[PDB]
Structures are given as C-alpha cells and as structure tokens.
Design a protein around this motif. Sequence first.
Motif, PDB file in Angstrom:
ATOM      1  N   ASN C  19       0.941  -1.126   0.223  1.00 38.23           N
ATOM      2  CA  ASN C  19       0.339   0.099   0.436  1.00 38.23           C
ATOM      3  C   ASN C  19       0.422   1.279   0.126  1.00 38.23           C
ATOM      4  O   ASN C  19       0.388   1.837   0.973  1.00 38.23           O
ATOM      5  N   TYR C  35       5.388   3.662   5.147  1.00 35.68           N
ATOM      6  CA  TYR C  35       4.908   3.796   3.936  1.00 35.68           C
ATOM      7  C   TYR C  35       5.479   5.585   3.358  1.00 35.68           C
ATOM      8  O   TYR C  35       5.657   6.304   4.666  1.00 35.68           O
ATOM      9  N   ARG C  41       5.449  10.919  -3.405  1.00 39.35           N
ATOM     10  CA  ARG C  41       4.318  10.307  -4.585  1.00 39.35           C
ATOM     11  C   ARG C  41       3.863  11.250  -5.343  1.00 39.35           C
ATOM     12  O   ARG C  41       4.038  10.901  -7.041  1.00 39.35           O
ATOM     13  N   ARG C  64       4.723   0.686  11.752  1.00 40.60           N
ATOM     14  CA  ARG C  64       4.398   1.923  10.747  1.00 40.60           C
ATOM     15  C   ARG C  64       4.593   2.692  11.389  1.00 40.60           C
ATOM     16  O   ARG C  64       5.232   3.759  12.322  1.00 40.60           O
ATOM     17  N   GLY C  65       5.988   3.632   9.984  1.00 38.18           N
ATOM     18  CA  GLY C  65       6.927   4.602   9.637  1.00 38.18           C
ATOM     19  C   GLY C  65       6.615   5.500   8.354  1.00 38.18           C
ATOM     20  O   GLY C  65       5.349   5.209   8.310  1.00 38.18           O
TER      21      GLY C  65
END
Lengths: 138, 83, 71, 99, 124, 184, 208
Positions: C19, C35, C41, C64-65
């Motif tokens: 993801n 992520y 992006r 999560r980072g």
Amino acid sequence: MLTDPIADMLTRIRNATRVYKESTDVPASRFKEEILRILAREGFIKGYERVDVDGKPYLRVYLKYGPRRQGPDPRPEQVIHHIRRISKPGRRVYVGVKEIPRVRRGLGIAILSTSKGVLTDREARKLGVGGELICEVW
Amino acid sequence: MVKIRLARFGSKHNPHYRIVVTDARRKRDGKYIEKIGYYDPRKTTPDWLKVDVERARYWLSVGAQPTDTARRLLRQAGVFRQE
Amino acid sequence: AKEKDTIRTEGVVTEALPNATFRVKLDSGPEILAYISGKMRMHYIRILPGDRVVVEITPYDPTRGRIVYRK
Amino acid sequence: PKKVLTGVVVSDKMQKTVTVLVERQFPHPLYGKVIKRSKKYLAHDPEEKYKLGDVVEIIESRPISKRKRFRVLRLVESGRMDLVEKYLIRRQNYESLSK
Amino acid sequence: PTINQLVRKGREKVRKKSKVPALKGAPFRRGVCTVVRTVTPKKPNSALRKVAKVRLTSGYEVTAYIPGEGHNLQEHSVVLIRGGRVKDLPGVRYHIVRGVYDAAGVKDRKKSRSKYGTKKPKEA
Amino acid sequence: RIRAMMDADGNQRKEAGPGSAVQVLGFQELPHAGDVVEWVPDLEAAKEIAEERKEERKAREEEEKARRPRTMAELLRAMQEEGRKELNLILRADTQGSLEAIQHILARESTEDVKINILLAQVGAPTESDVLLAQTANAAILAFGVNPPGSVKKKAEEKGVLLKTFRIIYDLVDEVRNMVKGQR
Amino acid sequence: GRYIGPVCRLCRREGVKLYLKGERCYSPKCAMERRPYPPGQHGQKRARRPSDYAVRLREKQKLRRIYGISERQFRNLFEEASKKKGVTGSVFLGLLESRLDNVVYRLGFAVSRRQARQLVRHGHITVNGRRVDLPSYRVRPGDEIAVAEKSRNLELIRQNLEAMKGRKVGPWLSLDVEGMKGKFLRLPDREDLALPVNEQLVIEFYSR
RNA sequence: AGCUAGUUGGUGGGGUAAUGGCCCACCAAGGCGACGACGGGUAGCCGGUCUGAGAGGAUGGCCGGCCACAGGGGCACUGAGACACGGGCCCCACUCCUACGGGAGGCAGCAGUUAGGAAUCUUCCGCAAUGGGCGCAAGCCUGACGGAGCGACGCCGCUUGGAGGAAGAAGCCCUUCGGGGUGUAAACUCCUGAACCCGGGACGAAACCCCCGACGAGGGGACUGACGGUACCGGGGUAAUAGCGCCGGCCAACUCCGUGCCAGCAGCCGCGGUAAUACGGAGGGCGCGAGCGUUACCCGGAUUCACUGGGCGUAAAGGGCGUGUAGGCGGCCUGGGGCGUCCCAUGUGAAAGACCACGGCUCAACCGUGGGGGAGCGUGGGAUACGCUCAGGCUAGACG
Ligand SMILES: [Mg+2]
Ligand SMILES: [Zn+2]
C-alpha cells in the motif's frame, strides 16, 4: 377467455378516446348498458345505442370529443382523460357511504354498483348507500 | 361484594374523585362497573360535586354497599333523602 | 497541538511491500512497515529495495513509519 | 345466539361422529379480496343419521369431546358430494409433496 | 404482481440489518483495551491513524478508533465505546468516547470539547 | 445518609455518641482507611465538597502522570524494548488496612529477574469483569479475607485464569514467591 | 429563558426594522438607518443568493424575534394552531399576539416587548383581578388587562401612558388611559397587523 | 413435511361447581396437515404509544384490564375462591447455623446491599385524604396509597434584566492602511426587583362519633394534617448562572493565523502532499438555550416489499418447456335464495389517552367535566346492482 367484460368495455372506450374514432362497438350487457347510460348522463360520451353485428347483440357508443386545439400537437381535446377499473375481479373493492371518493375533488366521477342500482357518486351520497366502486372516470 | 366508592385520579395536591360503582376487591383506580358521579375535594368549581341519583338508588336497591365518605357525599347530593 | 515526537532515522529498503509502503531495514533497529511520503507520490519518485531513506516513526506503534526523504 | 354454521359432511369414519367442512368467505384484512377459507369441525351425531356428502346446519354447543363442540341441528340438502370429492383430492395431494 | 400471489405468500418484510454489534443496540459498551496500535487507512486516504483492539463486556474482540489529538491510552486501559463507523478503516466500526474511565480528555481543545470530553478552560 | 450503625457486640444502634466503634452503613463509595468523617448541613453541600476534593486530587495526579514519557525518540524506544520480563497481578482484599500492607510487603519482594506489577488493586469480592481483565492481561487474581462467589469461581476455573483464596498474609506472600519462576 | 444579549444586531441580520427597543429603534438609532447591513465582518460584503429553505428560515427567525419567544414554545404554538381549524397562519399569528406580554406592548403599557414581558413578570400587570406574572398567558377575547393597584404610581408606566396619550390603539384593543386599564376585545386577525413577516413561508418551513 | 398412540371418536365409570381424553377400563382406527400441522427460534397479550398525509410500520415503559410466576420443578390441603408471592409438603440447587443426628431460609413488596452493567432514586415521613381488611363500635392494621428526597430523565413555566446610551472607547480581530468588525453590546445615567429576610398563612377534612328524631330521613355538635410553616398572600429588598453544537454541498452561518496526504475531521460526497469558506486555534456568524450535541433503537424520508402505490426485452428480475391437481379466476339472458356487499336501527366497542368544547392549578404542562367520533363484532329489519349458489335457457368462448 374474456375474463372481465366491464373492464374490457372500459379499455375499449379508452382506446377509442386515444384514437379519435367517433364510434366503437362493445358486446351487449345490461350492466354495461346502465354504465353507458350513466356516462352519457354525466356527459362523458356523446351517446350510446344497441345494435346487432353479425348474429350477436352489440352496443354502439358515440364518443364525445373536445374542439380542435389550435397549433402544436393539433389533436382535439380529450373528455375521458382517464378510466380505471377499480373493483378488479379477485381484488373487488367495495366502499361504504363514508368511504365514497370525491375523485378530482368533485370534477371526476366514480361509478358505484349498489343495491339501489348502478349509480353515480353524488347520487350514492344523496341516497346514503355504499357499494361496489366499479370504475374511476375522469 | 359490590361497593359504591371513590376513585382517586387527578394530580398530586390536585385530587379528583370518581363516585363510582365497583367490586370491593379492586384497585382504587381499577375496572369499575359504572361512573355514577364525580367529586372535587378542593371545591374549585361551582358544580364541584355531582352524582346521578336514580342510578345510585338502583345500585343501592340491588345491594351496592357504599363507603362512608361516599355515603356522606350521596346524602349531601340528595340520594338517601326520601319523601 | 501538533506533536513532533517523531523518530527521523535512516534505513535501507529491503522488501517490496503493500500500500505504497516498503519494509526498510533501519539503522536504529528493525525492518518495519513504513509507507511513502505523499510528497514523493506527487513527485512520482520511484523507490527500489535498496535505498538509504529517512523514516518518520511515531512512538505509539513502531510497526508503521513514513518514508520521508528522496533516497 | 349460538354460532350457527353451514357446511358439508366430509367424513364418517368414527362412531357417532360426523366431520364437517365449514367454508367461510372473508375478505383479506389488507388486500381487500375475498378468500374462500375452510375449517374442519367435528360434530356430534347421536344416531349416525347423517352421511358422507350432506350439507348440514351445525350449532355451537356444549362439548362432548376434545374439539367436538358442535351439535348437528338439521340437514339442509343431501347429495352435493362434489365438494367432498374435491376435499378428498386435496387431501390426497397433500400426501404427494412429502419426499 | 397479483394480489392473489401476495395473499398466498405475502410480502417478505425487510429484516433490517443491524449495522453495529455492540450487543443489544447498547449505546455505549465499556471495554478493556487489549492492544493499542496505529493503522494505514485506505486507497484514497493516507495517515497513521490511531486505533485500539478492545475487548468488550459482551465478549467481543473488536477494533476501535481513537478520536483526539494524541491519545492517552495504555495497554490495559478501561474504555467506553461509541460506535458509528470510520470510512477509511477496515474492520473498524467504533469510536472510543474520550472523557471517561481511562481515556482522559484531549488537552488543549477549546471549540468541539463535548465530543472529546474535555472540561471548560479557565479564562483570564 | 446513615442507614445503620452496629457496635462490635452485635447490636443495633440508632444513636451513637463520641467514642464508640459503629458499623456505619450508607456511603455510596468505599472510603479509605484513616479518613476523617465530617458533618454536613445538607447533601448538595457535601457533594460540592467532594467534587472540589476530586478536582484538587485528580488534576494533580494527572499532572504527575504526564511528566513520564517526556522523550519519545530514544527514551520511549528504551522503555518499549524491555529486557527483564514482568509478572502482572491483581489483588482483592477484605479491608483497606490489609491490601496496603500486602502491597508494602510485595514491593520489597521484587529483586528477582521477574518484576511484579499491580494493575488493579481494590477491596472486595472478585467478579467476571476481573476474570475478563485477567484474560486480556495474563494476570493472577489473589484474595485475602474475601471468599470467591460461586459463579465467579466457576468462571475462573473454566476460562483458565489464576484464582487464589487465602487466610493469612504470609501464605499469600509465599504463593507470590513461587510466581517469579526461573525456566532453568 | 429569553434570547438575552445584543438586540438590534438581530434587526440588522434581517435587513428590516424590527422595533425591539421601542424608542431609538424608532429614532435614527435602531442601526437600521445608520447602517442597514447584517452584523459582523461579512455583513458589508457581497450578499449571496439564499436557498429556498434559507429565506423561510430567516422569515421564521424574524417572526420569533419580533414576538420574543423561545423556539420550543413557538413550535408548540404552531402545532396548536395547526390542530385548530381556520387559517393556520393568521390564526397562529392571533394566538401569538394573545400572549399577555404582546398585548401589554400593544396597549402601550410598556414601550418594548421585552420591557412589557418584564413588567408582567414583576407583578405590575393584572388580568381581571389577579396580578399575572407569566407572559405566556393566553388571553381569550373580551378580557381586561390593567396596570396593577400598587404599580399605578410608578414613573415608567406614566411615561408609557403619556407616549400612548393621543396616538391610537389597534381595532382589537381598547384602553382606558385615565385608570391604566386595557380591554382586549377582538382576537387580532392578520389584516389588522401590517407585520413584515410572511406566515406562509414560516408554515412551509415548519411542514417537514 | 409429514406429525400423532390418550392420540381421534365411542360405551361405561371416576373426578370436578360443571362439560370434556381431565383421568381410567374396553371397543373402534381415527385425528390433524402445504387454507401450513408438527419442529426451531422468537415474544406475555392488549386498551395503547411513537411515527405516518394516510394505508401501514414498529413498540407494549408508566397508567388500565387479563394471563402467568413467585430459587427450579412436582403436588395436594383449607376454603366462596388457590394448586396459594411474605401458607403447606417433597426432591434438587444454593446461602445460613449444627453438640454432624438436623433445621433455617427466598426482596420478581417498599427502601437498601451487592453483582452484572453505559445506566436507574430515599434502609424517608404519614394514616391526614382515598381505598383495603377486621371490627357493633371506637379503633387497630396498611412500604395499597398520599406525599416529601435525589437525578435537567422527560415535558412545560419563569429568571439570568429593562429603558436610555458613539457616526462608534478599551480589549481583541481583520484591513486594500483610509477603514471595517465585535456593537447599543459595554461602561455610565434611570427604572423594575428572582433570590433573600420578616409578617401571616391555607384549600385538601367532613365525615364515620355523640345527642335530639325510631339506631330511618333529617338537625346540631365536636375532634381529626404526612405534605408543611409548604403553596400562597402582605411588606420590604440585591442587577442578580450562559452554555453547547456547528459554520465546503446537503444545511442556517466566513475570514485570518498555524499546520503541510502530517496532525486531524468525517454522516455521505470526501477534505488534508504550503494562500485549506472542510484540520487546530482565534475572531465573526448561525442554530438552539438551561440546555445543546454525540451514541443506540424505532418510524419517517423508503412508492427501497409498493394494498393505496413498483417492476421484470437491455438494469436485480420470466421458471427451459409441456400436460395437469389443489387453488384462484370467469361470457350473455331470465328467475329465485340473500352467503358476501351495502344500508337502517340497536347492543357492544370500559375507563385513561387521541379529537372538540368549557373549566381548575396566576399561564402552560397536568388534570377535571361533558361531548362526539371510532374500525371491528353480534342481533333484528331491509336492498338485490355486483360477486356466491340453485334453477332454466342462449350462442359470441371452448370442444366435436
Ligand atoms: Mg510528524
Ligand atoms: Zn432596533
């Protein structure tokens, strides 16, 4: 099998109205005749008659039509905008004196089959007898 | 047995009583046979208490044994008085 | 309030994970689920398993980072 | 006024007992259409005077057995067994759709 | 269709789906927070969103969202559950109501305090 | 409001003067040991006082709590990665003046590699909520002076959580000394 | 509870004079005249086209403010009006007027509606014998309001009377200016009241 | 999808206040079922309430009736009435004592304790009113009830002032630097005077009782207050709590700073990756207001289960067709019967509510009085157009 005669007659009438044909021919019945008479009285049709096509008793109906509407969509105006068999067979609706409809708030009419004969909404109200709401007519 | 009795309704501090005919073993609010009259203790209305007399008399005749207060009320109204 | 209590540590990308997220083996410790930055992006910076990226860890769960810096 | 009912003698398979089909035509509480809806009543006949395929007048009565709460008043008309036959056929059909 | 058909079988009344199983249609269930963790949301949205796996008085192990600018929640924290979905998060149908038991009010809120259970600020 | 007062002899007391031990029923919560009982003119005033007390205490407590995970970059990391594993335990005593004692006793009994932890310490009976909590946390339920309710006991038995009932503090302490283990 | 707080701001918000002070709300001072635009920053800004709902809502608010009532009470009144047969708008208006405070205001007992209400509250206003202290008092036609026995010799009342000395009263009302009396005669119809409100819109708003 | 073995009927008897397979003996082999039995789940039921234009849909809290159970189960006894909530016996379960042989218990009465749990009151006063029971009576009893206590839990009523009062203070906020906003809002003048203190002070309670009249009607007498020194009145008398939600579209109401696909919000579309009318704050607004919002359920919108009032070529939807049973449905005429259907009358449809009218509590809520309505259901009469049924005929359907 022709499964309802009154309804069939009504449908025929409606078709005639749609098509701008001056007269149609529906099979003969006393009830039907009475209904036609009532309609005539109201003013919804120009008149009615009984004749014999082939070897079968028949009912000719003179359709009334409004004056020619000038301009776009040049069709004459309709008198019987809508008919509906309310008391459908196997659904058969019956109303009391209190539940007599003022359809189109006094302008359209319902025809009621009653102990006192086949008769109008107003008449029913006057007489104070409920019955079968056969047909909505407007 | 059958009694002529007073049924409390109304509000707190604003009581109202139904002079009523009912069975003895009932709620003081319960399913009564007949409403024969009404009575306000607070005397707030001009027509503060009223009972229909004939019905009451009939009930008595049948054998409706009234409560003491009820009896008093009836007397006041003019049921038990005869001539 | 806006609480900047976040770890900004270096890590080599190791595993191509889900993801817009890349398991990156950290120099502070383990390989996590961190992520991509939205900035990245937007810029369409493509990342391969083997970049020395900066990860924004929030101490509530080190699971999560966030991959912040471009390679 | 005891409940007085019209119906046909469908079964004489027991002593002193007539089975009576009472068909009531009531309108549907929502859809306004009449449903010809039947119910079976077990009626007391002290003679076996009544027979398979007789339309009779059935009176609500003091009980004689567990769900035999009806006395037979009189015979209306005898020999319209068509209805009985229909009922029998229905019963037979009921057997069919089991397995 | 035909009224006759309806008479025969009838309209199958809508068994309205119970959208939240906090049991009984209970407005608020108190829960023990098993493990508090952070979550990646969805395809259109991106954030480290704060969540807690909470077990319930009913006997239901669920995931529960934490509103508020930074939680206070421990590992065996006593919580009260709101319910009401989150469009981002998978498996998650519950808010945690802040301002009760072990989820204390969000510090430095001044506008929408009621939802997050923080008391009136002392004005100067 | 005072509902019942009953002396140590086992007698019902309507009136109790200065200096007599009474079993006072009527407190909405279980008060702490050595708490000063006071008279109030009405209930609202009392409530207000209580609220004020809560405000005084609770805010301070909160403040105390808040100055602990200060750094979250490195300090937090240090504090999350735990070397010496801890044992969780949840106590339920008969009185306020025994639970505290127990706590004091077991705070010393922590020198071993396995460090004991109190998560919930209240006075009274064990319940199914407690069992649930234990299940969540992997904790032991220990009781002094209070016997377990039948239903509760059954629940404890079947679900697979540590249920304990005792007569003496010493026994409890001994039991605790078995809970640190060694593996080798 | 009342609205309570800044008054002529509400007037400004609507853009039509609401007479919520009496005097000053008559003089060049209601803020209708000095400044005619809505309050706060974007009042003097470009006024955007309002939605169908919005206009109705505004009208309703105007009405409520004019009559100075809590929303719940207003709603209840509306419901009552609906229940009763006639003209659900005009009748509603009449009912609202029948609020004691409003009647007092009309009879010139006090120069403002809030003021009137206050007066009523503070036992200064008597309806046929008893001092009545609740402005939600609904008066059925042919009924007498009076300035109370012990409030007849207070300055404000006198001033009010003087103000209404000369200038006439509504056709549903009569007032004895000598003895501080005031009969509510007819129930006030819509035609009698040249109110800026359109009741129809309010009704529409209420509907759903 | 088949169920049934006292199960369905009988004869005799028992048992009952009484019928009955309620129970038993014996004979018979039935009985029910797809017009939905039996089975599972679910659920006290309704008068109602909430919603809805209505039809309906959901619910059955309080109040009223009826049922059922008083730890679970079983069963009798006594009586007018129980299979007996604060009686009994028995087994089990559990709590409580035991000198271990045995007994005691039952709050689903009020209050309260815990425990569950998001969550729910006072171990209150009173027999004064009404009602209950006993009693000749006084009177005794009464956690029925009357009231008080707590909770904005609902609903309603009032207060948090009013009247002045700048071409506009400060404070704060924006600005295109002029200015604008907060805002007549404040300050300040004037006026009123919740609270508050004093002075009084209830209605509710006139009887049962005594005496005169015969212990009848009737007449007089007297006592009797938990609420409560409360409500309420009379005098005084302070300017005397404003909060919450939201502010991108729905949807009422907008700017700036901070933040930078982070932190966050969200009910839905979706906002957030450097000028965000969607995030945090600030001002400003708007909605309500002693409340407002969130959550949960229910209805509504949803004519998204469509009876009123949806459809089915391509959207979800015609079974693959045939024959055919139940079932449903039916041509024309004439006559009866009158089941449906309508009607008139009456009886019911209790009260409370809901609706209308008036009246009480200073209004309103609340309550009271009266009225009307009210589907449905019985009984009696009538009507025969339309179904239904019987009878007769017809030839347009159909069959030969
Ligand atoms: Mg960060
Ligand atoms: Zn003004």
